[PDB]
Design a protein around this ligand. Structure first.
Ligand SMILES: Nc1ncnc2c1ncn2[C@@H]1O[C@@H]2COP(=O)(O)O[C@H]2[C@H]1O
Ligand SMILES: Nc1ncnc2c1ncn2[C@@H]1O[C@@H]2COP(=O)(O)O[C@H]2[C@H]1O
Lengths: 180, 178
């Protein structure tokens, strides 16, 4: 049902997307993504099959704008295949690529988590398949299976800390003058 | 019981133990209930969480966190002001952020086990609560639904930090970023 209306949104908003059906078709890829979790213990096969039931998948073509800076968004994307350019309209610099990600990446977590507009645009540079997790689906997972929920949240925490460390190791040395 | 990593810090003898976070319940409540979308912490929940934390007073110029150190704990800043300082390859040592009352710092190493990404130095005398990774593990094991709320709070801390840092730092960059 959630997925029914989620699908209407994607097909309505995202004309180029082809619906692939349930994320169980990408169990092995999703298992690998989530089991990058460290320090807190892995997801079981059974836990991953359950998580897969919360998600539907889509194929995007080359040059598909998966996410657009400044748009509202309540969903994140697990990149199963392909390549995505993360770009931002940076004051005093114009539109620039801040990151390039591929198979295994998670994108769109920020607005899904905090309800602010998208921080950057994400464009499929190659044909790209992905699973979608909405905030509503996450709500339901935390309500129903909170321990699994905390594995998911720890995975997203580690995604963000790694991204923050990598990004600012790359970006700070390119800065000019005083930062504060 | 004081958290091991903190106890054995070089600056530890400069700290004054203020007691349990229960003594700072209102301050803790104000920090954790910045949570959005997913539901607020009840007062009972915040009381329970307080049992997992000790509070300390640090003097001015205290190096609360040191870049490169092991870091299995985070700090909730109750009062004071803190400079986030980093050794930037090519640029040198710079203040990259300033935070104050209500801020959370040290979340990155606590979450991922890498060495501290920056130093955090009290520019005014600063009081803080300490949450260890061990305490978090117990909380998740003992009380997963309350755990969910702590984790969402930390997620939102990081997303906000990403966004606010982007808005401030990216416009100061020169050339290609990747
Ligand atoms: N430095 C980065 N590295 C990788 N991905 C990023 C980076 N910054 C932003 N993103 C992604 O871009 C997405 C745009 O939408 P969100 O802000 O919801 O979530 C953002 C992140 O998933
Ligand atoms: N841009 C920033 N703004 C606020 N705090 C930061 C920033 N960069 C790093 N920090 C904090 O500095 C801390 C150093 O220890 P951690 O790496 O564990 O966690 C880090 C963050 O809590």
């Amino acid at each position: 049902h959630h997925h029914h209306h989620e699908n209407l949104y994607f097909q309505g908003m995202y004309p180029d997307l082809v619906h692939l059906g349930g994320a169980d078709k990408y169990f092995e890829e999703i298992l690998e993504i989530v089991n990058k979790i460290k320090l807190f213990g892995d997801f079981s096969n059974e836990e991953v099959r359950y998580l897969c039931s919360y998600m539907q998948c889509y194929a995007a073509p080359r040059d598909c704008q998966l996410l657009t800076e400044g748009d509202p968004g309540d969903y994140l994307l697990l990149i199963l295949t392909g390549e995505v350019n993360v770009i931002k309209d940076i004051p005093n610099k114009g539109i620039q690529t801040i990151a390039k990600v591929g198979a295994g990446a998670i994108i769109g977590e920020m607005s899904m988590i905090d309800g602010m507009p998208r921080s950057a645009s994400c464009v499929a540079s190659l044909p790209t398949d992905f699973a979608v997790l909405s905030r509503d689906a996450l709500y339901q997972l935390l309500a129903n299976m909170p321990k699994l929920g905390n594995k998911v949240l720890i995975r997203l925490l580690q995604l963000l800390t790694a991204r923050f460390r990598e990004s600012y190791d790359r970006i700070l040395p390119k800065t000019l003058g005083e930062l504060i």
